[PDB]
Amino acid sequence: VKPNYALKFTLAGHTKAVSSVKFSPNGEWLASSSADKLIKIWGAYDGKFEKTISGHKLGISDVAWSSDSNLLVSASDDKTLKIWDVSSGKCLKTLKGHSNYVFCCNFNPQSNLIVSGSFDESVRIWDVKTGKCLKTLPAHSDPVSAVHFNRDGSLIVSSSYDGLCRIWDTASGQCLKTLIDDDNPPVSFVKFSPNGKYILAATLDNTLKLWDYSKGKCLKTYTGHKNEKYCIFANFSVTGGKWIVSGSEDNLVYIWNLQTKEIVQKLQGHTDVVISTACHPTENIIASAALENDKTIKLWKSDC
């Protein structure tokens, strides 16, 4: 079994590199963030432009949706995070506290909290209602590349250029586990599996690794792609066949069989590094976005 992802739409509009694409939990929309300081909303099924959301003073590295699809959070080079009302496009809160670029962000499932990672090497936990910083974790010794809550929001996983993956207890702010491997190459991306039992981690040695973080064992390795410079988003594709999806520095979207580790498809079309990929919550749809020499978002559809 192999998917047959085929190009459906090319979404043009960003004037600089696209940095992150995410599907709304309700599947109706795709949100994109960019170095052009804008957040754009698109129709997930027709690729139709919906609206531009603005307010950040500098480029945005990440955007994330709340569980009800009503809010977005964005992480910017301006050292802040902003919480946006999607329907109005209005900035509800500006989260201030990071002392360097904000790189990654996510809401917890309950969506009362936001987790952020910054070049300031810290991980911050924010209260959505007040915009107050609840906890500052001295998480890593280098820029924090990714932060993600697990399925029940009890845990946060963070990754850094320091070569470590750390699992944190959300309520206590304490570090539960540190994952180290080989010679500690920079960790460019991390996220929990949908069941929260595993973590998918990308390293700048052209490798993706599936970890059983509690047992501290690497179960699978995904290679063949190019990843030595950028913090490229990777995903678990679960709507059809069980795949691992990632962008690559060779301008391709890579799709591996989760179990066998074999490359099942390479999606050609982008003209620059595919920095971000996202998997649709209900349909076999992939959104992919590329850097400065491309600046577009592509929507791909598969039968499986």
Partner 1 sequence: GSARSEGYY
Decide if residue 77 touches partner 1 (CB under 8 A): yes
Written as six digits, the tokens of 162 are 């320091």
- Give the residues across from 171 on adjacent strands: none
Binding positions for partner 1, 172-231, rule CB under 8 A: 186, 188, 204, 228-231
Decide if residue 62 touches partner 1 (CB under 8 A): yes
CA angle 240, 244, 248 (to 5 degrees): 130
Decide if residue 251 touches partner 1 (CB under 8 A): no
Decide if residue 101 touches partner 1 (CB under 8 A): yes
List the one residue from 291, 294, 297, 298 that touches partner 1 (CB under 8 A).
291
Where does this chain touch partner 1 (CB under 8 A) — which range of 59-67, 105-113, 148-156, 194-202? 59-67
CB of 249 to partner 1, least distance (A): 9
Decide if residue 58 touches partner 1 (CB under 8 A): yes
- Binding residues with partner 1: total (CB under 8 A): 29
Decide if residue 143 touches partner 1 (CB under 8 A): yes
CB of 245 to partner 1, least distance (A): 18
- Residues near partner 1 (CB under 8 A): 16-17, 19-20, 33-35, 58-62, 76-77, 101, 103, 119, 143, 161, 186, 188, 204, 228-231, 275, 291-292
